[PDB]
Paper text:
We here present crystal structures of herring [name], the first structures of this protein from any species. [name] shows a bi-lobed structure with four domains arranged around a common active site, forming a deep cleft between domains I–II (residues 1–195 and 196–308) and domains III–IV (residues 309–425 and 426–567). As expected, all four domains contribute to the active site with one loop per domain; loop 1 (residues 119–126), loop 2 (residues 292–297), loop 3 (residues 379–384), and loop 4 (residues 507–520). Herring [name] binds substrate similarly to PGM1, but lacks enzymatic activity.
Crystals of His6-tagged aPGM5 belong to space group P21, while crystals of His6-tagged bPGM5 belong to space group P21212, both with one molecule in the asymmetric unit. The aPGM5 structure consists of residues 4–567, except for residues 511–513. Despite crystallization of aPGM5 in a condition without divalent ions, a metal ion is observed in the active site, coordinated at around 2.4 Å distance by Asp292, Asp294, and Asp296 in loop 2. Due to the long coordination distances, the ion was modelled as calcium rather than magnesium. In aPGM5, Ser121 is unphosphorylated, suggesting that the phosphorylation state is batch-dependent. The structures of apo aPGM5 and bPGM5 are very similar (root mean square deviation (RMSD) of 0.64 Å over 545 Cα atoms), but aPGM5 is further closed, showing a shift of up to 2.4 Å of domain IV towards domain I. In contrast, aPGM5 did not crystallize in the same conditions but at other conditions formed small and irreproducible needle crystals in space group P21. Interestingly, Val330 is involved in a crystal contact in bPGM5, but the corresponding interface is not formed in the structure of aPGM5. The structures of aPGM5 and bPGM5 are overall very similar and even the backbone conformations at the mutation site are essentially identical.
Residue numbers in the entry: 4 to 510, 514 to 567
Write the structure that this text describes.
């Protein structure tokens, strides 16, 4: 009754370079470009050491987008033919990125494959992605990234078990006897929320949260899963377990196309939530991305909690959470483009702060060496060492726990925080799908100016606002664990007037330039100012000095947050 192992001849693709958040292509590429999915999967598998690959376990999940159930079928076939012993898969293929990280860590899997494009639309016309996480549970480190690219560039063949078929609909085991293999290749379809839920039980006070979402004084919340993966997570956790009304759950039926909407939590694409939070009926609002790792939070009347502020506010109030009461707090970390608001909190409560490059994987070594307990990014990301990924619902539960302890509302906390520590006005401009070449020459020409020998003695004037350059360079990071240096991680112009400008280049299939602007103000009276007025100038400096409009032929940013 054996299942044969078939080796297929193939020719390599040149574009299979995995980005900071996996390999993202239009669904057509994976679905029609022959041997494209197989080539990449085999590459991911070959990056695993040959010795360690035998009999090991991997976790597989998706956000439910179109082509996921087909990608998983190929994943189990190629996994079996490559010696993997067991695959843990989510019911119906549904497993959020935080849950995948939690499973990898619990059962001590060698890694996990996540089918998702995070903030990108899904469906036959939409996009598709493949993320690969390693043993510690976080995203693949740079070493693995290069290894995958190297293999993908030289792949001549791949192994697969085409005669293998799997049913995700019913939970349990599905043993397969492979040829020339004693132990049966196992496949475990597990509950999508159970293991992840039990992790949260040990972190938070579910009684405290349950009481806030219950009673005459109950909090009225609207949680928008955007028809992604987090639908069943909020329904089973927030509603069923924590007692929130059913109407609190919105767009919680995972759809292949996300109902035809973008799952990008922010003031631009989560308009469905902002409209309701503008009505004024709800005291708390939250939206998740497709895979459930990013999260936007809104107060009453659509009070926008800036993710950099969200990270600092939470840091300042971690005592409300049992997890950090017991284990304490060993350090904070933030990506470099994230505002220095957390730095304020840390210098106050005497805790270390690490300024890492953009990308959650750079948080792995800090947590694995006990140097960091809590971290986040301006990119709507936050998390702790309960796993090694950013966790959306963890952020909501964190905020609900701080609200039940403070006995206040969202805006009350944030403004109180501003009074005690000052406000870090912050915003980000995104220029998506711009010509990759122009984006490149824009960034090195700009670096050439930033790097000039006399640039630090330059002053920029917008009306009566003057910004004097203090230090500017191309960001560089030295890993404190292995001592490896990460370069070209974002240009920086630090002015000696409590302000920063950051320029970051990341990956039609074109480039994306993001411009971050930060300005700090001490006086609480000037904390009511409009961010557009505080940050308006800084951007004007950034636009003239970068000349991004003329260089890219764009008239405005694709997105503002
Ligand atoms: Ca994501
Ligand atoms: Na992502």
């Amino acid at each position: 009754n054996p299942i044969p192992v078939v080796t297929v001849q193939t020719t390599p693709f040149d574009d299979q370079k995995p980005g900071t958040n996996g390999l993202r292509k239009k669904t057509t590429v994976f679905e029609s470009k022959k041997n494209y999915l197989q080539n990449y999967i085999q590459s991911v598998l070959s990056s695993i050491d040959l010795r360690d690959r035998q009999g090991c376990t991997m976790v597989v999940g998706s956000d439910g987008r179109y082509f996921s159930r087909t990608a998983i079928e190929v994943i189990v076939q190629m996994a079996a033919a490559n010696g993997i012993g067991r695959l843990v898969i989510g019911h119906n293929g549904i497993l959020s990125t935080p849950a995948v990280s939690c499973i990898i860590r619990k059962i001590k899997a060698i890694g996990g494959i996540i089918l998702t494009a995070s903030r990108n639309p899904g469906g036959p016309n939409g996009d598709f992605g493949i993320k690969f996480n390693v043993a510690n549970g976080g995203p693949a480190p740079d070493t693995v990234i290069d290894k995958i690219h190297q293999v993908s560039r030289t792949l001549e063949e791949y192994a697969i078990c085409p005669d293998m078929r799997i049913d995700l609909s019913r939970l349990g085991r599905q043993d397969f006897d492979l040829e020339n293999k004693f132990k049966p290749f196992r496949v475990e379809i597990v509950d999508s929320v159970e293991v992840y839920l039990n992790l949260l039980r040990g972190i938070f006070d579910f009684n405290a949260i349950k009481g806030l979402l219950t009673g005459p004084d109950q909090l009225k919340m609207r949680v928008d899963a955007m028809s992604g993966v987090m639908g069943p997570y909020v329904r089973r956790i927030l509603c069923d377990e924590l007692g929130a009304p059913a109407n609190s759950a919105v767009n919680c039926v995972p759809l292949e196309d996300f109902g035809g909407h973008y799952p990008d939590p922010n003031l631009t694409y989560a308009t469905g939530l902002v409209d309701a939070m503008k009505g004024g009926e709800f005291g708390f609002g939250a939206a998740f991305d497709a895979d459930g790792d990013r999260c936007m939070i809104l107060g009453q009347n659509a009070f926008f909690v800036n993710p950099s502020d969200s990270l600092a506010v939470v840091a300042a109030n971690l005592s409300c959470i049992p997890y950090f009461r017991q284990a304490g707090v060993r350090g904070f970390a933030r990506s470099m483009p994230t505002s220095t608001a957390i730095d304020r909190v840390a210098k106050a409560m005497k805790v270390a702060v690490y300024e890492t490059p953009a990308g959650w994987r750079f948080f792995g070594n800090l947590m694995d060496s006990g140097r960091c307990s809590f971290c986040g990014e301006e990119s709507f990301g936050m998390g702790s060492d309960h796993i090694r990924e950013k966790d959306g619902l963890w952020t909501v539960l964190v905020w609900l726990s701080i609200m039940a302890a403070r006995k206040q509302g969202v805006e009350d906390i944030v403004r109180d925080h501003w009074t005690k520590l000052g406000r870090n006005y912050f915003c980000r401009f995104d220029y998506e799908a711009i010509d990759p070449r122009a984006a490149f020459y824009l960034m090195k020409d700009l670096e050439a100016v930033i790097s000039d020998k006399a640039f630090c003695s330059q002053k920029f004037a917008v009306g009566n606002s003057v910004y004097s350059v203090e230090k500017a360079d191309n960001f560089e990071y030295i890993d404190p664990v292995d001592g490896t240096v990460a370069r070209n991680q974002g240009l920086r112009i630090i002015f000696s007037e409590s302000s920063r400008l950051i320029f970051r280049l990341s990956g039609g299939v074109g480039a994306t330039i993001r411009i971050y602007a930060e300005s700090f103000e001490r006086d609480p009276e000037r904390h009511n100012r409009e961010p557009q007025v505080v940050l308006g100038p800084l951007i004007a400096i950034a636009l003239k000095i970068s000349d991004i409009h003329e260089r890219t032929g764009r008239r405005g940013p694709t997105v503002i947050t």
